Design a protein around this ligand. Structure first.
Ligand SMILES: CCCCCCCCCCC(CCCCCCCCCC)(CO[C@@H]1O[C@H](CO)[C@@H](O[C@H]2O[C@H](CO)[C@@H](O)[C@H](O)[C@H]2O)[C@H](O)[C@H]1O)CO[C@@H]1O[C@H](CO)[C@@H](O[C@H]2O[C@H](CO)[C@@H](O)[C@H](O)[C@H]2O)[C@H](O)[C@H]1O
Ligand SMILES: CCCCCCCCCCC(CCCCCCCCCC)(CO[C@@H]1O[C@H](CO)[C@@H](O[C@H]2O[C@H](CO)[C@@H](O)[C@H](O)[C@H]2O)[C@H](O)[C@H]1O)CO[C@@H]1O[C@H](CO)[C@@H](O[C@H]2O[C@H](CO)[C@@H](O)[C@H](O)[C@H]2O)[C@H](O)[C@H]1O
Ligand SMILES: CCCCCCCCCCC(CCCCCCCCCC)(CO[C@@H]1O[C@H](CO)[C@@H](O[C@H]2O[C@H](CO)[C@@H](O)[C@H](O)[C@H]2O)[C@H](O)[C@H]1O)CO[C@@H]1O[C@H](CO)[C@@H](O[C@H]2O[C@H](CO)[C@@H](O)[C@H](O)[C@H]2O)[C@H](O)[C@H]1O
Ligand SMILES: Nc1ncnc2c1ncn2[C@@H]1O[C@H](COP(=O)(O)OP(=O)(O)OP(O)(O)=S)[C@@H](O)[C@H]1O
Ligand SMILES: Nc1ncnc2c1ncn2[C@@H]1O[C@H](COP(=O)(O)OP(=O)(O)OP(O)(O)=S)[C@@H](O)[C@H]1O
Ligand SMILES: [Mg+2]
Ligand SMILES: [Mg+2]
Lengths: 270, 264, 270, 264
């Protein structure tokens, strides 16, 4: 219970520090590019074009889903994926390559994976703004239901930050854990509603029912209901939202306890 | 008269492995016996306010381990360190990124040392003036020379105001025209009565700077006391070592390393 | 023409150097793992299990293909993928992070992406041996047709090495090029016969005809014909093999010219 | 009497950018005018066999640029370097990996310097004996101390046999008990009549080691000649610089940097 308060207080008095270090990390990883920090926008867009060419034309021949054309349906669903994948991949190893540069300084050590996640959250916010503007060009305009993004986008950030806070400590203690994340993230990607809906294709009693336990299913569905379908998603899916909040709380609790136990000994595992 | 740093029975032990099979047995078996190396072995010394302590010894003695334990980066396996006051370490390169420009590195390193936004905005220009980089402060750090990078790192690192200071291997930095400013800044740190730990092999700077000597030999505190009492004995050991044969020096190194290794 | 002979001679008097540096690179990237260098085997196997759970059970319900069960069909097809993806990804940036450690030594600079590729080729060879042993357990035994692997596995290595030799020089001159490879490799992955065959699903006149221009289609099909189907693949697909050899020769020619032109100036672009 | 290194009109120019927009215009426009920095400006000196040449100067003068141009790592923008003989550079850390053990680093670094398998297997044990690491030669290099890593890197690097040798910032390495062996090895390199280029700020080692001095000031060869002719004038410049005011030193630095920057 002291671990929760410690990690929470180190996150709340260092909000500007997290934002500025995330901006510096964005400038660091894009320094030698001619296009600069625009690649954080360009590379997900190219991957989106690849995924629409494969899973839209090759699988269902660009058929509409729920009265929405497939390109915008996929565009709202895949918007948070690149952030989730990149934040979980890069911030699992964040303390592994960033502890030694702040070890001799009095630094809040629990915010290192958080700013590594925020460096991808910037590109997520830019991509989401472009996705909303691109959805404006068809006839899907923002209704009153779009203020649910003020709940859903911070939820995606907090899920990524809690998972990253657990997996960064586990990666320092066992390096093998970072190798596990490649298979884990493909499990989270393909077993989700982002590229397909298993209602008009195959079995719903096993494939679609087990997809609800993925937090990705809630995040993609919630953004689609906020942006595309113009419905309040929490009227019919409040139990799923409660389960997702419990998942976030459990990940944050276990991650905050493990970090407080091993933070003094991190030089030993590195 | 007031104790600033109190080190009581500090021991640092490292498990030593040759294969991955040995590492995995030690991890998985609760009573596995393995080779253990004593980087430090029962160190007990206390520092007062205004003490400038030089850490001397041969390579691999354990003075960087003791300095990192004092600075808080490394945890003791056994014993406790009690510090009254803040600790700062002068290591010039820890926050420096080649990708960032010199102006960007000053803010990033200063944010990582814990300075606030108004403080960084206040003391950026005298850091720029002290570094004497000129037009290259808007250029990336990977385009610098080694002396320019060292000057920028020292200019950022010298702006701390701790109670306990730890300096590793460099009182000065740069060419001959820059070293006197570094000496003046370090002597200004000495003038405000701060506990300074100095780790170096340059015995001239140690003699002209420090007031107490902590001699580390084979993970143990060989001697601790005043500079004029302890430093001539370390110098006598140093001149006595070169007058031995190669077999005698190998025998001394083997006898030093025999006690530092143990199966437990 | 002098560039071809120069790069060829630097590759043929440094074969032992390439092998030993590749072994050292394998030991370097797996040093802190408890399981050691076994992760080069374990992580593709876990990804194989993910891909069979998704594209085998979810898409076609583990239906057999060409008289072969889907798990072994996918197992022979996906065996070279992880090597191709990892070698093209890591060796595009090989001169970017490995030039400065050999710049002051008299070193053959064209073999750096080759040993980076060979470090993944070791795991490819181990995975292929396990795939053949796993195919033995059903009833598919090695016939006389398996000596085509002595042509096809070196072809996969040489394709990866030629593409890597071009893309390493382009990455030093323009860093943006390394950002392009993420979308390019997904294009090469999904538009191929590794996870599906577009004959029993959809259009063959456009999707399946354009898949022939992928070198991946030849490599997966050739391994399957050598290992599973027990046929000589070059009787019916000699034109495709000639096209693939021409692709390899063109990639090697353009890569060897660009490397010889900029190798003295690499410190400038780094 | 025979020329070993011949440097003729060597100039190194670097394009200087502040934004990515300037970098992109220079790349895409055939006659774009941009700020250019002269790291070196028309260097002409020739070295004979047996010459030990010290490269002196203030920070950012261009002596590492000239040493990398001589060593072959860096290409001149203009001019030519003609070398009769092989060139080796003593840089201790270039092949050292923390992940590899000290025994593994010796083979990896030696393979990257271009030694053959039989040569590496022949001279591994005297490298181990020279490094004096003991039991830590089977331990990973990231577990070493800084002096142990320096000793291992020097022990691997000292085994080259070139015609032209380039040494940067370190004749010796380690503590006081190890530096004499390094001095003996470097003096043995001097004894077999090799052209040695030495780049350092330590003027005592330069005076006791070198026979000729190349003074570099602001990217230009200020003076080149015998040690007793050129080194007292560089020392006189060094003592003259500290007796100026801060405004005079800033004026000297600005006048030095004014000629090195040009729009072209
Ligand atoms: C695929 C690969 C498979 C193989 C993987 C095998 C890896 C297992 C490693 C075990 C591990 C990882 C945590 C596990 C994950 C988190 C769990 C939850 C995850 C849920 C999502 C947990 O080790 C923890 O160590 C704690 C030490 O405080 C200990 O605390 C309590 O312990 C006792 C009461 O049990 C009690 O005496 C103690 O006082 C308590 O404090 C914990 O009980 C113990 O679990 C870390 O091992 C640790 O490593 C340390 C530094 O190397 C090492 O300390 C060093 O000390 C010297 C230097 O200073 C030097 O001599 C050595 O360098 C080393 O000895 C520890 O000794 C070692 O244990
Ligand atoms: C690089 C790009 C290349 C792409 C590579 C090609 C691979 C594409 C795979 C195609 C696929 C994947 C489904 C996706 C699953 C996603 C969940 C996974 C989640 C796991 C984590 C999509 O096929 C879909 O599934 C159904 C299959 O028909 C169909 O459903 C409909 O069924 C109702 C009647 O039962 C119907 O009344 C109602 O309208 C729908 O409900 C859908 O409309 C159809 O689009 C699987 O379907 C396969 O393909 C074909 C479809 O036609 C089908 O072949 C034939 O079908 C007809 C004769 O049978 C014939 O007429 C077709 O001409 C012929 O084709 C195969 O037999 C089938 O097995
Ligand atoms: C998404 C992002 C979009 C933006 C991307 C824009 C990037 C474009 C960059 C252009 C680029 C990349 C090659 C292109 C890719 C390969 C092509 C094939 C690919 C097929 C798969 C090609 O630049 C090449 O440079 C050669 C230089 O020898 C030149 O050769 C001939 O040139 C003339 C006759 O044309 C003739 O006078 C010359 O003598 C010939 O030798 C080539 O013609 C020219 O193409 C590299 O630019 C080069 O960069 C160099 C170091 O920074 C730079 O030298 C430096 O010199 C000083 C220091 O030493 C210093 O002053 C500066 O540091 C810099 O000046 C070069 O000047 C510059 O040109
Ligand atoms: N993580 C580690 N695991 C095992 N041994 C270690 C580790 N870190 C340091 N050592 C050993 O601890 C001993 C002393 O470490 P240091 O304090 O760095 O040496 P030192 O006294 O500073 O000598 P220098 O730096 O060469 S003057 C050396 O023998 C190191 O090899
Ligand atoms: N890639 C580069 N781009 C731009 N400027 C550079 C680059 N590399 C070096 N420089 C500049 O070139 C000048 C001289 O470089 P160096 O030769 O490394 O300096 P130096 O004479 O060795 O001085 P030291 O190392 O501090 S004693 C410095 O002003 C550097 O900033
Ligand atoms: Mg230098
Ligand atoms: Mg040290």
């Amino acid at each position: 219970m002291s671990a929760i308060g410690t990690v929470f207080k180190e996150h709340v008095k260092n909000f500007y520090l997290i934002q500025r270090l995330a901006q510096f990390q964005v400038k660091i990883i894009n320094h030698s590019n001619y296009l600069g920090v625009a690649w954080e926008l360009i590379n997900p867009v190219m991957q989106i074009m690849v995924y629409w060419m494969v899973f839209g034309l090759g699988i269902r021949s660009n058929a509409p889903i729920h009265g929405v054309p497939f390109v915008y349906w996929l565009l709202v669903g895949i918007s948070m994926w690149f952030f989730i994948n990149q934040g979980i991949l890069e911030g699992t190893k964040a303390i592994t390559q960033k502890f030694n540069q702040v070890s001799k300084m009095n630094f809040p050590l629990s915010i290192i994976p958080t700013y590594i996640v925020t460096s991808r959250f910037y590109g997520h916010l830019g991509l989401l703004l472009l996705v909303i503007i691109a959805c404006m060009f068809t006839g899907i305009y923002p209704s009153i239901h779009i203020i649910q993004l003020l709940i859903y986008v911070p939820f995606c950030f907090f899920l990524t930050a809690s998972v990253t806070l657990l997996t960064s400590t586990l990666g320092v203690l066992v390096r093998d854990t970072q190798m596990l994340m490649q298979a884990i993230l493909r499990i989270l990607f393909y077993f989700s509603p982002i590229l397909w809906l298993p209602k008009n294709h195959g079995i719903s009693g096993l494939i679609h029912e087990m997809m609800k336990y993925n937090p990705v299913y809630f995040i993609a569905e919630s953004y689609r209901a906020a942006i595309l379908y113009h419905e309040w998603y929490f009227m019919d899916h409040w139990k799923l939202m409660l389960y997702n909040f419990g998942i976030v709380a459990i990940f944050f609790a276990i991650g905050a306890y493990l970090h407080m136990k091993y933070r003094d000994q991190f030089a030993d595992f590195l | 008269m007031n104790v600033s740093v109190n080190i009581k029975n500090v021991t640092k032990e490292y498990r030593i492995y040759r294969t991955n099979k040995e590492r995995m047995k030690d991890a998985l078996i609760p009573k596995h016996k393995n080779k253990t190396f004593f980087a430090l072995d029962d160190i007990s010394l206390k520092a007062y306010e205004g003490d400038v302590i030089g850490l001397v010894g041969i390579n691999g003695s354990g003075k960087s381990t003791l300095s990192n334990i004092i600075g808080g980066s490394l945890s003791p396996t056994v014993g406790k360190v009690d510090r009254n006051g803040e600790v700062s370490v002068i290591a010039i390169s820890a926050g420096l990124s080649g990708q960032l420009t010199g102006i960007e590195n000053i803010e990033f390193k200063m944010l990582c040392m814990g300075f606030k936004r108004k403080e960084i905005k206040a003391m950026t220009p005298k850091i720029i003036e002290f570094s004497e980089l000129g037009e290259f402060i808007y250029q990336p750090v990977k385009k610098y020379s080694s002396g320019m990078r060292a000057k920028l790192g020292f200019s950022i690192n010298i702006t701390v105001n701790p109670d306990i200071l730890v300096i590793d291997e460099a009182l000065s930095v740069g060419d001959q025209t820059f070293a006197q400013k570094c000496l003046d800044k370090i002597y200004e740190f000495k003038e405000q009565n701060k506990t300074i730990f100095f780790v170096s092999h340059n015995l001239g700077q140690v003699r002209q700077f420090c007031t107490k000597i902590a001699w580390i030999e084979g993970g143990k505190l060989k001697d601790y006391g005043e500079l004029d009492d302890v430093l001539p004995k370390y110098e006598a050991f140093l001149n006595d070592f070169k007058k031995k044969s190669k077999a005698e020096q190998k025998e001394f190194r083997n006898k030093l390393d025999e006690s530092r290794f143990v199966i437990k």
